[PDB]
Write a structure and sequence with these properties.
11 strands; Trefoil (Acidic Fibroblast Growth Factor, subunit A); growth factor; epilepsy; mainly beta
C-alpha cells in the first residue's frame, strides 16, 4: 500500500513554500524553484496522507510531544489527516495525538517567519495551519 503519490508543493498562507532539506530540516522558503519544495503526497487512508520530501526521501512526522520531525522509515507518526478550511485551504493533522479532554487536533504549521511550530500550538482557525496544495501535474 504505497499508492502513487502526486508530486506537489505546499504553499503556506503565511507566504512561504514548505520545504525539506536532505538532512531532514523542515521550514519555509520564498524560493518556489528550489527542488526541496517538492513533496510526494501519498494516500494511505480516506483523506489521510504521508508527506515525503522528494529530494530528501524522508517523511514528515509528528511525535507524541507535538514536535515535527523527518523520518526515513514509515510509521503511524507519518500519517496526516487532510481537512479543509474556508473550502480553500488544506490543513494537516496528526492521526494519533491531540489535546486531552478538549479533543483539539495537532497540526503541521509555519509561523510568520516561515519556521515550523509545535503541533499543539498550531490552530485550525489560524493562518499558520493553512496550506494551498499546488500539484506540479503528473
Amino acid at each position: 500500500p504505497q499508492l502513487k503519490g502526486i508530486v506537489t508543493r505546499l504553499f503556506s498562507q503565511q507566504g512561504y513554500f514548505l520545504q525539506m532539506h536532505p538532512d531532514g530540516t523542515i521550514d519555509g522558503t520564498k524560493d518556489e524553484n528550489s527542488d526541496y519544495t517538492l513533496f510526494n503526497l501519498i494516500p494511505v487512508g480516506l483523506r489521510v496522507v504521508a508527506i515525503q520530501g522528494v529530494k530528501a526521501s524522508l517523511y514528515v512526522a509528528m511525535n507524541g510531544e507535538g514536535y515535527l520531525y523527518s523520518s526515513d522509515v514509515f510509521t503511524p507518526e507519518c500519517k496526516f489527516k487532510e481537512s479543509v478550511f474556508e473550502n480553500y485551504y488544506v490543513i494537516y493533522s496528526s492521526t494519533l495525538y491531540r489535546q486531552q479532554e478538549s479533543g483539539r487536533a495537532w497540526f503541521l504549521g509555519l509561523n510568520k517567519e516561515g519556521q515550523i511550530m509545535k503541533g499543539n500550538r498550531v490552530k485550525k482557525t489560524k493562518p499558520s495551519s493553512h496550506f494551498v496544495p499546488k500539484p506540479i501535474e503528473v
